[PDB]
Design a protein around this ligand. Structure first.
Ligand SMILES: Nc1nc2c(ncn2[C@@H]2O[C@H](COP(=O)(O)OP(=O)(O)NP(=O)(O)O)[C@@H](O)[C@H]2O)c(=O)[nH]1
Ligand SMILES: [Ca+2]
Ligand SMILES: [Ca+2]
Ligand SMILES: [Ca+2]
Ligand SMILES: [Mg+2]
Length: 166
């Protein structure tokens, strides 16, 4: 079976862990525990292929972002996450993308842009704005909620499909 090495990156609090944990363990994490670096592994069937997802959940806080560069180097695809109720996290995305380009030493890295927390009504980032950004990078935009499960499978699976196009 093929292994896919997925990396989840973005600002602190945007819901990286919650998204990952919702995909792998099928429940919502209500509390906020800042992440250092954790991995998860699940065998899944995606478009007929049995594959091993290896997911690295990275830190978003400056204080906890110690070995992040080194860990991200082996990533085959990256989930770039912001929260639709946090404009600064959307503004920060470019910096995460620049870091992926450094760490992979390449212009062409499989990525998906993710607007998380789409269950909340306090939207400051409109879909159209995220779509444009994603369009400039040549990647898709998917909105997700880790709370309701909406788009969660779709976002990670799309990322596998992006890696397959590489
Ligand atoms: N309503 C809602 N809340 C969410 C969602 N995703 C995450 N949260 C909430 O936001 C907080 C932070 O989520 P978490 O996954 O820890 O964020 P993170 O990106 O892994 N934080 P860090 O970068 O510090 O590791 C948690 O209290 C969590 O319940 C979502 O889709 N909807
Ligand atoms: Ca819970
Ligand atoms: Ca602001
Ligand atoms: Ca606005
Ligand atoms: Mg986390």
């Amino acid at each position: 079976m093929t292994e896919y090495k997925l990396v989840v990156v973005g600002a602190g609090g945007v819901g990286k862990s919650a998204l990952t944990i919702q995909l792998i363990q099928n429940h919502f994490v209500d509390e906020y525990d800042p992440t250092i670096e954790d991995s998860y592994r699940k065998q899944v069937v995606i478009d007929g292929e049995t594959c091993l997802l290896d997911i690295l959940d990275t830190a978003g806080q400056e204080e906890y972002s110690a070995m992040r560069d080194q860990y991200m180097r082996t990533g085959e695809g990256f989930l770039c996450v912001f929260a639709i109720n946090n404009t600064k996290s959307f503004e920060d995305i470019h910096q995460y993308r620049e870091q992926i380009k450094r760490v992979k030493d390449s212009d062409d890295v499989p990525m998906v842009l993710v607007g998380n927390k789409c269950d909340l009504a306090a939207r400051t980032v409109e879909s159209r704005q995220a779509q444009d950004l994603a369009r400039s990078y040549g990647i898709p935009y998917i909105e997700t909620s880790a709370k309701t499960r909406q788009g969660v499978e779709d976002a990670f699976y799309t990322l596998v499909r992006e890696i397959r196009q590489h």
